[PDB]
Design a protein around this ligand. Sequence first.
Ligand SMILES: NC(=[NH2+])c1ccc2nc(C(=O)c3nc4ccc(C(N)=[NH2+])cc4[nH]3)[nH]c2c1
Ligand SMILES: [Ca+2]
Ligand SMILES: [Mg+2]
Ligand SMILES: [Zn+2]
Ligand SMILES: [Zn+2]
Ligand SMILES: [Zn+2]
Length: 223
Amino acid sequence: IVGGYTCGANTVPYQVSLNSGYHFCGGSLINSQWVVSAAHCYKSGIQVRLGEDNINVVEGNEQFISASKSIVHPSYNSNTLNNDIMLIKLKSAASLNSRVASISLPTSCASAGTQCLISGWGNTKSSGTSYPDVLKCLKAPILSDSSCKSAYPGQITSNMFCAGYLEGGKDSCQGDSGGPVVCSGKLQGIVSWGSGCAQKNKPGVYTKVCNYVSWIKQTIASN
Ligand SMILES: NC(=[NH2+])c1ccc2nc(C(=O)c3nc4ccc(C(N)=[NH2+])cc4[nH]3)[nH]c2c1
Ligand SMILES: [Ca+2]
Ligand SMILES: [Mg+2]
Ligand SMILES: [Zn+2]
Ligand SMILES: [Zn+2]
Ligand SMILES: [Zn+2]
């Protein structure tokens, strides 16, 4: 997250860190046994770490659970990143408490202008590399589809939306991938892609979760 602030320990209790020996992507807890992340974050051997703040220090509120199965969207396209969403089932159910909570799926899609909260342990420099150990947050509005499409001509589909600032400065970035974009208490997006991080007129692009709710509900009920 570039141009954001330290969230505060466990103030984003549905945020998850996907670990394969190190943190490589974020995700969101949607119920005690399931996590939603981005399909471009797919790996074999994922351990889900819940209740995290500093990912390099065990502070006492974490739950480390291995994944039993991963399901990448049937129509995920790795070249265009269309349908960039994946579901991960936990081997054991997580214990929900104040520090570990699930986030709600949307009943409808959010409007341009709506303010959202984006979080993650991804890079914090636009021109440089600095990976934080504690969770970073960023409040950003959903942009209009026309500014999103003018920034990325022929690359935005109906399953994506842009959020951020065209002036540059604040954006999600590599490492934040798969993490949550929560607006009005619902999970509306998944950190997916962008052009570099925080560059002017190159806002972040997110998976539009409201288009996948029936696929999510049907898939977790049958697995
Ligand atoms: N398992 C891997 N090897 C892997 C995992 C995640 C990755 N992510 C990128 C990436 O290249 C990438 N993820 C981004 C997310 C947001 C923005 C943004 N500017 N909003 C830019 C991004 N670039 N490469 C990745 C490689
Ligand atoms: Ca920790
Ligand atoms: Mg994240
Ligand atoms: Zn990369
Ligand atoms: Zn990138
Ligand atoms: Zn990524």
